[PDB]
Design a protein around this ligand. Structure first.
Ligand SMILES: COc1cc(Nc2c(C#N)cnc3cc(OCCCN4CCN(C)CC4)c(OC)cc23)c(Cl)cc1Cl
Length: 266
């Protein structure tokens, strides 16, 4: 046991937020004062330090644009205790009521924050393995954080967000996260629309290997789709860094699209 462990008696499992093939997610209260969120094991569901190795990644990672670990439980019943994100998933946020008021400036800045989280990941020498809008939590003031490193690792599988070399040959790198970041960029600019519309997994895998790439989403600037294309380069090592992507997006509206005017959607 380590210093990340707490008494479970500390924990008010209150409202329910979701389920899965893993367990649940709950709003709750920690030591009576603190709002938290808990990813649960409903008793047996799966392996101990499989559920509890997303902790071992999340313990050593610690950035403002990453969802924060608060504590863990193995005094079974079992829990992963984390920082509570008020507006839920970026996917739900984009599809929901506020989604449609979202404009490029907002969307680019969300992209930015995420780039920022991932750039930290990048210099910590970790890989996320599952980057996509569904694993981005939104809080107040349009804040976005990376969450659910649930497969993550030191650099020692829903394929539409997955880089070819990673889906096919299991080559997961920060460079394959980048690939996913570019796909994540199509989600933001379409307001949550599933990538590769009308295509099934195997068809996506076959067309992407022949070099098919998603075209510029409607009302999305060419400069922003260029960036997605860079993120989707065949050779992993030619994809840009999260550091370049972070700085590119923060500076976007001055350095890159300094003449942008809003349309009916973006
Ligand atoms: C702890 O373990 C993990 C937990 C999570 N999941 C969450 C964490 C975290 N972290 C924090 N806070 C969350 C808040 C949620 O909903 C709150 C508000 C929802 N509404 C949207 C619609 N409007 C109009 C009302 C508000 C939520 O919904 C499912 C999931 C959350 C992930 Cl993604 C990964 C890991 Cl590893």
């Amino acid at each position: 046991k380590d210093a990340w462990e707490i008494p479970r008696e500390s924990l008010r499992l209150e409202v329910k937020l979701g389920q899965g093939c893993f367990g649940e997610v709950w709003m709750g209260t920690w030591n009576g004062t603190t709002r938290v969120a808990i990813k649960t094991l409903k008793p047996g569901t799966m392996s101990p330090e499989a559920f509890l190795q997303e902790a071992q990644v999340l313990k050593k990672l610690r950035h403002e644009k990453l969802v924060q670990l608060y504590a863990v439980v193995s005094e079974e019943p079992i829990y992963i205790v984390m920082e509570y994100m008020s507006k839920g998933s970026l996917l739900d946020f984009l599809k929901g009521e506020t989604g449609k008021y979202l404009r490029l400036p907002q969307l680019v800045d969300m992209a930015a924050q995420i780039a920022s989280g991932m750039a930290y990941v990048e210099r910590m020498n970790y890989v996320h393995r599952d980057l996509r809008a569904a694993n981005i939590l939104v809080g107040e003031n349009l804040v976005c954080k990376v969450a659910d490193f649930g497969l993550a690792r030191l650099i020692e599988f829903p394929i539409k967000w997955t880089a070819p070399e990673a889906a096919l040959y299991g080559r997961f790198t920060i460079k394959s996260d980048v690939w996913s970041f570019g796909i994540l960029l199509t989600e933001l600019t379409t307001k949550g629309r599933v990538p590769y519309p009308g295509m099934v997994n195997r068809e996506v895998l076959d067309q992407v290997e022949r070099g098919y790439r998603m075209p510029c989403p409607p009302e999305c600037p060419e400069s922003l789709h260029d960036l997605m294309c860079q993120c989707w380069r065949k050779e992993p090592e030619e994809r840009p860094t999260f550091e370049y992507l972070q700085a590119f997006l923060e500076d976007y509206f001055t350095s890159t699209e300094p003449q942008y005017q809003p349309g009916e959607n973006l």
